[PDB]
Write a protein that binds this DNA or RNA. Structure first.
Length: 849
DNA sequence: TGGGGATTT
């Protein structure tokens, strides 16, 4: 054991801490408490009873409305604004099956509709069931909810379906996504929503009494939410026999969903695209004849294949397939030569380049912009080259979606983002490198890694279709057919990669009290060892007790649209009067950073973040400083100027602002804040006390700690609490920095690409870790008294400061327990506020001088 | 000295 630095406090301070604690200890309406006992007392049978009576709105129909809408429907089908809209709808394949679909829903609780992009299942099925019920005189009984995986898709589909019905958005078609909703009318309506919206809504309506038809779309993508939703349908559907569910899928292991719902009926609806020809690595080199010059088990795969095609391809070509670097994107000048080829031959259309990541997109971009070869300079002024990456601005501007200038061809250099998320309509040529990146958690080593991996058969299929929108196109796949046969069918279902704390907690609100038993009933069951790991995290932050039962704090966390750790952090910030900065840290960690990463500018990006961090050595306070800056720029009408200067997405920021308020209102409704405003003065008296913020940030990120032992840009000898050597990720504001006032850091994410990096970090001080952490004991190991945290970091501390900090931690735990059970804001002049002031005072001993 | 991609009454 090595003894860290001294944390003994001055006698004068300890004497005041003792005084405040004794004031706290001389103190003697909770609707929330009875709800919490009522949840624990009922079994699932009773919960099912209770929820039926409480959500009865659909037991009521409006016959005067049923008839009124039935009349207006027939009438508007003979007008000449519609019935052009109907005749163009009738060219969509789905509409040929309308009547079989209507009947299939009538006779079966669950059906599946499987169809290719272009088939119109998403826009046409909901309209088919709605217009049916209206005509039959049931309009007011019909409320259709259609999920989508992506926010942008949910909206545009809504605007489109609303167009096909001659309505402004919000009469019969609407959308609801997080913090933005154009709600449709109450009854006889179709609502598009993100799958997550529906999940949070389950708490209030656990058995889906507030809808008549659930349509799950794009379930073949296996997002956690669709897979999670389907498992929940097996628990719900035996108790909702009048509910109708329609599953929807691409032709990507569609049979898995049909098998899952026990043998249910399955429609196959044909798609409407232009034919796209698939070429593979043998065919690409055959046309461009590019020359390469500058384990194997490349050979185990490639030679058996080269033998089967000896008579179909030239012998010089087949030799290049022996080169390990011919496939994938190892040689970028190979892809560059494939673009220059298309620019000459293969007449006009745009080129869509699929590259794995930021690094390789930069390489191809510089080559197409700064060519070293004659062929490249010939073409440079004739390409309009757009990089496409979630961290790059090009997606949030209208240039990459419009047609290129005259005499120029549009070339898009993209990640997998352009596969489904982003759509460019004039793409005719797709170059498919076959390589993407994936984050993989290894449960055995507690290491998350970011690796370059092969794409799956489903992916390649999706990138092909991207070329069949305007006219028949070509897709160039830079791998051999011997590779495709060795590629997987689909990507790993993402639920097997995801942290389970959120789900395990959210399940408790649905009275699904055994996460091991329930999660095993999913399409792909997550590793039970990963389930246990989640329960311990929840027991460690005291949201579950040792018996696994929900705790009062745990019920609060489960209701919040954020991970339980950052939910706790937000809660602490309400009790400690730093609501505004902390909810910036929580909102940013959950959603994303507001910062772009434009090509070439990586040095200037580092400088913008150095300045925004204000030497506070915390990535999270840095974002809050940015938001404080953003608000000021809205006050001065410099909003655009400010964002241009600091590489900021106004869209990201505005949505971070919206999340801060959602947290504030929830905390307000739960009786933890006096005001629903995250800026209110009362919620924020401590918001300028930087040592205090670091304490609450650490309470959120604990026990993810790091210790730095080296000084030199600067080199760092730094290791996490598990012992492994790490560095600050270069995108972090602590990379290469020297002269820290403390040697201990907290982090949200640790990830290995070239070394073990902390993607994000906040420097914290020992006394705050000790107060809000666990594994705290006082003793003697040298002839020195110590005070430790996590039983991992042992600090020099005299017996007077230890006995106080231990007694302090008790009263803190006693308070947190009471506030969760009996939520009420901390009054400014009460007993509770004194214990707070005691903690502020001990934490300020670390203030910068 | 480096950042696959969604999302939450």
């Amino acid at each position: 054991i090595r003894l860290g630095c001294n944390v003994s406090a001055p006698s004068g301070v300890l004497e005041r801490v003792k005084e405040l604690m004794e004031d706290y200890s001389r103190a003697p309406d909770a609707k929330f408490q009875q709800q919490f006992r009522h949840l624990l007392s009922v079994n699932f049978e009773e919960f099912v009873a209770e929820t039926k009576e409480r959500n009865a709105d659909l037991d009521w129909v409006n016959p005067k409305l049923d008839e009124r809408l039935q009349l207006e429907l027939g009438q508007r089908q003979l007008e000449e604004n519609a019935k052009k809209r109907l005749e163009a709808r009738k060219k969509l394949p789905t509409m040929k099956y309308a009547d079989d679909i209507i009947q299939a829903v009538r006779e079966n609780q669950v059906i599946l509709i499987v169809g290719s992009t272009g088939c119109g299942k998403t826009t046409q099925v909901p309209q088919i069931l709605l217009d049916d019920a209206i005509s039959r005189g049931c309009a007011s009984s019909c409320r259709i909810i259609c999920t989508q995986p992506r926010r942008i898709s949910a909206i545009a589909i809504a605007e489109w379906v609303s167009y096909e019905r001659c309505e402004s958005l919000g009469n019969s078609v609407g959308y609801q996504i997080r913090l933005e909703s154009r709600k449709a009318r109450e009854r006889a309506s179709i609502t598009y929503c993100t799958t997550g919206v529906l999940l949070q809504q389950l708490q209030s309506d656990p058995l889906m009494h507030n809808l008549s038809v659930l349509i799950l779309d794009e379930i073949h993508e296996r997002s956690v939410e669709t897979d999670l939703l389907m498992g929940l349908l097996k628990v719900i559907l035996p108790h909702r026999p009048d509910l109708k569910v329609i599953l929807m899928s691409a032709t990507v292991r569609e049979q898995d969903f049909c098998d899952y719902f026990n043998n249910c009926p399955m429609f196959r609806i044909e798609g409407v695209m232009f034919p796209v020809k698939m070429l593979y690595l043998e065919d690409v080199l055959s046309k461009t004849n590019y020359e390469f010059q500058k384990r194997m088990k490349h050979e185990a795969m490639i030679e058996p294949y080269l033998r089967r095609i000896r008579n179909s391809y030239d012998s010089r070509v087949l030799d290049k397939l022996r080169l390990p670097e011919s496939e994938g994107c190892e040689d970028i000048d190979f892809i560059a030569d494939l673009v220059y080829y298309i620019c000459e031959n293969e007449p006009e259309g745009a080129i869509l380049v699929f590259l794995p990541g930021y690094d390789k997109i930069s390489q191809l971009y510089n080559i197409l912009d700064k060519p070293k070869t004659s062929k490249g300079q010939r073409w440079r002024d004739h390409m309009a080259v757009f990089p496409l990456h979630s961290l790059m601005q090009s997606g949030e501007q209208q240039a990459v979606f419009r047609r290129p200038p005259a005499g120029q061809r549009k070339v898009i250099i993209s990640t997998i983002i352009a596969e489904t998320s982003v759509t460019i309509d004039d793409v005719v040529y797709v170059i498919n490198s076959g390589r993407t990146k994936a984050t993989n958690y290894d449960i055995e080593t507690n290491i998350q890694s970011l690796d370059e991996v092969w794409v799956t058969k489903a992916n390649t299929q999706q990138r092909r279709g991207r070329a069949g929108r305007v006219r028949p196109g070509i897709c160039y796949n830079l791998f051999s057919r011997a590779r495709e046969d060795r590629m997987d069918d689909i990507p790993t279902p993402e639920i097997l990669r995801s942290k389970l704390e959120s789900i395990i907690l959210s399940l408790k609100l649905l009275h699904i009290d055994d996460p091991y038993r329930f999660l095993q009933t999913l399409i792909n069951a997550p590793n039970p060892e990963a389930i246990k790991m989640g329960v311990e995290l929840l027991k460690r932050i005291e949201a579950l007790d040792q018996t696994g039962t929900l705790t009062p704090l745990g019920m609060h966390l489960a209701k919040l649209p954020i991970d339980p750790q950052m939910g706790k952090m937000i809660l602490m910030s309400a009790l400690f009067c730093c609501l505004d900065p902390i909810t910036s840290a929580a909102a940013a960690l959950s959603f994303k950073s507001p910062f772009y990463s434009p090509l070439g500018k990586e040095s200037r990006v580092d400088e913008i973040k150095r300045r925004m961090a204000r030497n506070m050595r915390s990535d999270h306070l840095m974002v809050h400083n940015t938001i404080i800056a953003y608000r000021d720029s809205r006050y001065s009408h410099a909003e655009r100027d400010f964002c241009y200067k600091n590489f900021l997405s106004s869209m990201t920021l505005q949505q971070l602002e919206r999340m801060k308020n959602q947290f504030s209102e929830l905390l307000y409704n739960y009786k933890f804040l006096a005001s629903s405003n995250c800026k209110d003065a009362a919620s924020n008296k401590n918001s300028e006390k930087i040592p205090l913020l670091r304490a609450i940030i650490g309470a959120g990120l604990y026990p993810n700690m790091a210790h730095l032992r080296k000084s030199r840009r600067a080199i760092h000898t730094m290791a996490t609490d598990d012992g492994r050597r790490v560095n600050f990720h270069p995108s972090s504001v602590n990379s290469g920095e020297s002269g820290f006032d403390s040697a201990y850091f907290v982090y949200f994410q640790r990830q290995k690409s070239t070394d073990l990096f902390l993607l994000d970090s906040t420097m914290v001080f020992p006394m705050a870790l000790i107060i809000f952490g666990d594994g705290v004991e006082a003793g003697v190991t040298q002839n020195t008294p110590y005070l430790c945290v996590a039983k991992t970091y042992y600090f020099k501390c005299n017996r007077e400061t230890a006995d106080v900090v231990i007694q302090l931690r008790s009263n803190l735990e006693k308070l947190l327990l009471k506030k969760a059970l009996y939520p009420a804001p901390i009054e400014e002049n009460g007993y509770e506020k004194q214990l707070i002031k005691a903690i502020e005072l001990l934490l300020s001993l670390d203030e910068r001088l």
